RNA sequence: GCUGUAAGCAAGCUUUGAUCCGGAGAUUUCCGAAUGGGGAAACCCACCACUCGUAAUGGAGUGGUAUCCAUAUCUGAAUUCAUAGGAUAUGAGAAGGCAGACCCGGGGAACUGAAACAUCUAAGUACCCGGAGGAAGAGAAAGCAAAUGCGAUUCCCUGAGUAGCGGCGAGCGAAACGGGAUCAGCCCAAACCAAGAGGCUUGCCUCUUGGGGUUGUAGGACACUCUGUACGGAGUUACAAAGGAACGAGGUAGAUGAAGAGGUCUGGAAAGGCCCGCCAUAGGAGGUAACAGCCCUGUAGUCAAAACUUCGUUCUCUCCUGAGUGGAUCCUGAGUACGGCGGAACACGUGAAAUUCCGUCGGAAUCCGGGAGGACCAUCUCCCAAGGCUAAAUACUCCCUAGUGACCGAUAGUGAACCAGUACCGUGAGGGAAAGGUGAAAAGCACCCCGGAAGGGGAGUGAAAGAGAUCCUGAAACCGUGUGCCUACAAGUAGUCAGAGCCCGUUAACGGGUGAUGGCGUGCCUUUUGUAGAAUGAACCGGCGAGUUACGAUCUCGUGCAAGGUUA
RNA sequence: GUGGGUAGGGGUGAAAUGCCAAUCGAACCUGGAGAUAGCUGGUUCUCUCCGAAAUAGCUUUAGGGCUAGCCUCAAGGUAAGA
RNA sequence: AACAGUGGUAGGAGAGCGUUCUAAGGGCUGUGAAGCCAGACCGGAAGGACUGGUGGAGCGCUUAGAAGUGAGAAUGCCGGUAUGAGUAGCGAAAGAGGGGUGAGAAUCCCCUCCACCGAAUGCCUAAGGUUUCCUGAGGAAGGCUCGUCCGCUCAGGGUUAGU
RNA sequence: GACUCGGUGAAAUUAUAGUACCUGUGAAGAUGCAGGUUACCCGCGACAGGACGGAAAGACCCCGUGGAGCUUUACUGCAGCC
């Protein structure tokens, strides 16, 4: 409230909107993938039972905040344009589902 | 559980251990008269009848669970059992198996 | 042993088995839906049959006699048929109530908020009215949903205070996906065929009965191949209704039931201390002259119901075919669906508004069809509305058993522990109290003295009588009676510090009480710039009386685990 | 006098805001209702540590509130502070 | 241990005391529990303890937990008791005297004088009231004072219709 | 009626008060405050100047974003009527 002065949520404009569909390919930090030593076959089903991905909201991207140094036959739905370099220079395949 | 008139000891109380028979029972109040036990002097109005009034020498009756029967044989204070062929639940006195 | 409260007297009754407790009946004046009629509730008056009685009238008993509806049957007006209507009998029809609740439907506000208020909210809340059932409502797709799809509704948790709605403000606020509890699906209608009837111009087409027939990438008819009429299945709760009779287990009454007076002491009384013994599938509770496993009722375990029930199984009984193949064509829900106008319910306030439901106008297709996929159109995916049945999962309690409370202990807990919705208060709808405890039992005070009598003093009763009728405990305000010290030259919010005299000896302390008089000193609280306040509050005394609780959000503090934590 | 009707955003009034059960510019009862109150009264045991303000911007707002202003608790920064 | 501080409303922080109940055992009670009253005792307070007397069956301590957790003020609520105060008031309106009753008489009864209403304070009977009527006893309570008396209390009795 | 005796016997109020006067200071008009002066202790019968005496959370004024009743070419609307 503001006494009777027209308060701050009314002196300020709307900013619409929210999507009819917004998808959150989330989350894979890249240094989560050093949970495989050595390991391959990085799939969300092999990540669901290992708790790196808590709940998979319509797919996952792989986000390049990290490094390896490990090869991984990565089977993921989406990738950053940096995760096609760390997985790639390590020699592991970076298969987009 | 005791009836008029079985042979009766006094478990506890002021008269702890005397015996006597039963003048009357009062089963709704759970309380039994014994001769000469809880002998209490009572003052009475001059009646109609008798004209004497005076002091009487009655007994106020006794609660039932300060009263036991006796074995006829040992003369012991004994607890009560039952189940008697052709006896209509006649009391087995413990230290088996005397009736009544 | 019994004749309830009730504590006493008379009269009686009972192991030729009484008092009590259950089952099954019978009895059940009158009012009350009241129902023959009137009625101002608890009363009057009838009539029709039948009985009792008088010579008869009068009088008395026994049933029947409302209203609506339905099944029939006679009659049957203006008016001819015929009908309205009238008369009669049959209906173990239904009107009333109440568990102040929960669930549908019709109506349906305001106050409050939005800091005003009128859109909104409050709120489809309360309240009124109709429904019944122990539950109701909904329900087997014109459903979600957009894949490798799910498969009737309901309820719970998430989803999430998200998508949204809103003078977009107050506030309102879903669904679907995910996981459980519960878990069953089916009949009608329509064509086709059989039997009646009923008319038309034979023909033709129009109502009932009996089969058949229950649908979606379509099903049925129809036709053609099979398949049964059983021994297979079902069944009274849907699925179609409907009967019995046996086996077992609960319930409305029970019955059995272990172990010590252990001794001593204190005592009015052991159930308590000490020293001891046992039982225990029983140490649940409650009495017991005081705190009992063993004294009693019982408890734990077992076992029983003549009669009523409630439930589960069987037998009896009852009832019943399912499929392929094609589509020459006939069906698949009409004044209905949708559409205009006007409203309401959907979280959606008339909107880009899907959807449902009403009023009023219009008004289609009927498989080559049609509907949903949040205005609208094509493609694509589901799915057949315009008919109906559906237990359980759910919400509930005036209730009835058994039980549990970090619930209450009489100014509390229901208003009512007490003859409470009583007394009183109101014309009346209505408001609505206060009031617990002798003792272990009446042993409730025989007798004497005073007194008219209550009321006492002795005497006994019991542990207490100071316990004796408000009857355990008894405080304070108050009201007394004795008093030790002060007071009749004194001006005082009454106290404090000083202080001699006088009087007492202590939770043994630089004691206690009164303090002649002196120095200081204008109550407590609220509200105020400021109150001794001539500003408010309080007569006093005692009791009751106000910051939480439920659910979330935030910060510190603590604990576990740590890019892994919690599970509804 | 008897007998009897007219019922509360109504009745009734040879009218005054009168009367409607001792109540009238809207009768009493029960509920929504624990309506709301920026307004008044009340806010129950002790000790210590610190310790305000009655100013401003606004405000259907002036005896209300909301940010600042001054207070307090805790943690960092560090000697900024005067 | 050294040095400094230590008034205080609104308010923030910290530490405590209380009461009731539950949970561990441990410990007091008929050789007397709780509560009550007394008292010159101890800690910083809220507060505790001890001896006496009453009281006649329950109760504390520690350690945690729960909270219908604390009274002086609400023109609060209920109950009791004051103050005013032996004060206002004792509800229009003539009795007096003798006797009797009884414990007690102005107030009760009887008698005799006197006085008031007499188009009402007469009788009769509606509205209502539901025994208030009569007798025989009492008398605490209601009678605005007594009170042998009553419309009070008890115990009986009491209302007869073809007009 | 009042006064007195005998019977019976309340209420409003009320922080505790053993309650003098005047001049001053004070919340600006004292019994209780300072200074001064009077005043043996306790009753009864009266009067009413004071205790801002009781009685009624002021009727007057003003505030409440309080309410009611009423009025109209105040707003938006309802019935009624056309």
Overall geometry of chain B comes to elongated
DSSP, total strands of chain A: 2
Amount of helix of chain A: 10-25%
Which CATH class of chain A?
Answer: Alpha Beta
Number of helices of chain A: 2
Number of domains of chain A: 1
Q: How many angstroms separate the termini of chain B? A: 12 Å
Just name the CATH architecture of chain A: Ribosomal Protein L15, Chain: K, domain 2
Number of helices of chain B: 0
User: What's the Cα radius of gyration of chain A?
Assistant: 20 Å
Helix content of chain B: under 10%
Q: Report the principal-axis shape of chain A.
A: elongated
Largest sheet of chain A: 2 strands, parallel
The run of helices and strands of chain A is HEHE
PDB class: translation
Keywords: 100S, Bacillus subtilis, cryo-EM, Hibernation, HPF, RMF, rRNA, YvyD, translation
Entry title: Structure of the Bacillus subtilis hibernating 100S ribosome reveals the basis for 70S dimerization.
Chain A: 50S ribosomal protein L15
How is the secondary structure organized here?
This is part of a larger assembly, with chains A (97 residues) and B (100 residues).
Chain A: H1 44-48, E1 74-76, H2 83-89, E2 94-96
Parallel strand pairs in A: 1-2
Chain B: E1 8-10, E2 19-20, E3 25-26, E4 31-32, E5 39-43, E6 55-59, E7 62-63, E8 67-68, E9 80-81, E10 92-93
Antiparallel strand pairs in B: 1-2, 1-8, 3-4, 4-7, 5-6, 9-10
Chain B binds four RNA strands through strand 5, strand 6, strand 7 and strand 8.
